[PDB]
Design a protein around this nucleic acid. Structure first.
Length: 52
DNA sequence: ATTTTACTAACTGATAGCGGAACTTTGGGACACCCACAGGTTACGCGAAAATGGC
């Protein structure tokens, strides 16, 4: 009963919801990027990675 | 002089530890599309007490 009350999606609906998820994740990523501690961490991770 | 015994040292087994490689074990992943379930059942009967319905 509780599940049936939700309508089924279509292709356009699935793409729209996925786009909203990606948009939210992008906003979160932009928020984390505006942080003095974030970018140096990624830079040092790449520094260790490129050293194999 | 001889026999029994106490002392001591060497052998051996059990055992705790370790190495390491094989073996078991755990967690992650898989992109044509798939989109609401069972699921046997019951020929009981009787009395109480508890929950519903009638105006």
């Amino acid at each position: 009963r509780e599940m049936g009350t939700v309508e089924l999606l279509t292709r356009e609906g699935e793409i729209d919801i996925a786009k909203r998820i990606e948009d939210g994740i992008n906003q979160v990523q932009s928020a984390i990027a505006e942080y003095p501690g974030t970018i140096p961490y990624i830079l040092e991770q790449f520094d260790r990675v490129q050293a194999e």
